[PDB]
């Protein structure tokens, strides 16, 4: 019933600056008000729009009463501006960062990375988007009318207490299984409707849940055409009937909109501890798409981009990352995250093979590496699915072993280290994270 909220597409001003204010306010869910946090607003955040090769400065004002950090998930930027747990912005503080984007068009995102409290700060409402454009993507005639036929879809669950407030506590169960709830939000709204031009509709999907994996489909089983993953366009669209999306992952899809029939985007029950409990025991509506008769702008191209050949593996450095959960201690290579002790020093500008194992438990670990867009060689036992075979910043690890081919183009010293971690936020917050350096 409510219309789908559309994050503002925020570009630079004449001074080449973008302002983000982090703050607390109020939102309403099912007629009950709650304290929430947002960037440039009460909840969630804008879509920061960047152009490849054009530097911008982002002025970040922390108007929370606790410290936070601002991490650009998916961006290939130096450790200095990565906004991992060392990137502290004190209460009432200001921090400016220069972003010099040098990667292909993609939908990335941004969120807090406060040490030990990333889950709570995301749960409270902090997340925004990053839209990177380049000259290539603009030649494709994709749907491009922001908030009309090019729509961000940030999907998140929340657990609310009886008083209507967000209920987040990092207790033993929450630390093991993750924070999840029985209420689904779509750009902050409960089961919103979106009026979409007849023709093609582009959805920029973000699984912004702390712990819940998702599996997108349409209520009448019309296909979704995947055109992009975390790190940008696929070579060609990949038609799917369902689309699993792990925590922190993005996919852009095209879906057909026919004059007549409204339909829902839905999420299908998943096989994951906690997540099949009602109301997620059956297909669960995410949003209603309402066909309208206004001008469309784009269509589905036969070809999207050119992906590089995977290079020969001979002579590449191999790094092994063993994930574990010992009682209440979550760790990598037998170590809970130590912010003053990067685990290893990666080379800058050199392909490496990273092998990440979840052998020893059956929990779901979407493993995310900062500072890169990588290629998955093996995902949890098999070469990746076609729509997952392009540029990724996350790889599934669940009771098996994954292998990714990674290259870091920017420096990250000990004082501003890159993170590699499980993006089940409660696992990260209780130790399933390492720091690593790149270059000097
Ligand atoms: Cu990240
Ligand atoms: Cu420095
Ligand atoms: Cu995990």
Swiss-Prot record:
Activity dependence on pH, as recorded: Optimum pH is 6.5 with 2,6-DMP as substrate. The pH dependence of the reaction as monitored by oxygen consumption shows a broad activity peak between pH 5 and 6 and a second activity peak at pH 8.
Temperature-dependent activity: Optimum temperature is 55 degrees Celsius with 2,6-DMP as substrate.
One GO MF term attached to the UniProt entry: oxidoreductase activity, acting on diphenols and related substances as donors, oxygen as acceptor
Cofactor: Cu cation
Deleted gene: phenotype: Disruption mutant is slightly more copper sensitive on complex medium than wild-type strain under aerobic conditions. Deletion of the gene does not affect copper sensitivity under anaerobic growth conditions. Deletion of the gene leads to elevated biosynthesis of enterobactin under conditions of iron scarcity when copper is present.
CDD domains: CuRO_1_CueO_FtsP, CuRO_2_CueO_FtsP, CuRO_3_CueO_FtsP
Binding site residues for Cu cation 2: 73, 111, 423
Keywords: Copper, Metal-binding, Oxidoreductase, Periplasm, Repeat, Signal
Cross-referenced Pfam families: Cu-oxidase, Cu-oxidase_2, Cu-oxidase_3
Subcellular locations according to the entry: Periplasm
Induction data: By CueR, in response to increasing copper concentrations.
Enzyme class, spelled out: oxidoreductase
Summary of activators and inhibitors of this protein: Ferroxidase and phenoloxidase activities are enhanced considerably in the presence of excess copper ions. A labile regulatory copper ion near the T1 copper site is important for the copper associated activation of enzyme activity. Ag(+) acts as a potent inhibitor of oxidase activity by binding at Cu(+) binding sites, blocking Cu(+) substrate binding and oxidation. pPD oxidase activity is strongly inhibited by sodium azide, an inhibitor of the electron transfer.
GO CC annotation: outer membrane-bounded periplasmic space; periplasmic space
Plastocyanin-like domain boundaries: 25-135, 197-262, 329-438
Gene3D superfamilies attached to this UniProt entry: Cupredoxins - blue copper proteins
Binding site for Cu cation 3: 113, 370, 421
Domain of life: Bacteria
Consequence the record notes for mutating residue 325 to L: Almost loss of oxidase activity with 2,6-DMP as substrate. Loss of the copper tolerance phenotype
Domain free text: Contains a methionine-rich region, which includes a helix that covers the entrance to the type 1 (T1) copper site and blocks access to the T1 site in the absence of excess copper. This methionine-rich insert is involved in the binding and oxidation of Cu(+). It also binds additional copper ions, which are important for the copper-associated regulation of activity. The methionine-rich region provides at least three additional Cu(+) binding sites: Cu5 (sCu), Cu6 and Cu7, which play related but distinct roles in CueO oxidase activities.
Record-linked NCBIfam families: PRK10965.1
Oligomer status and interactors: Monomer.
Protein name: Multicopper oxidase CueO
Species annotation: Escherichia coli (strain K12)
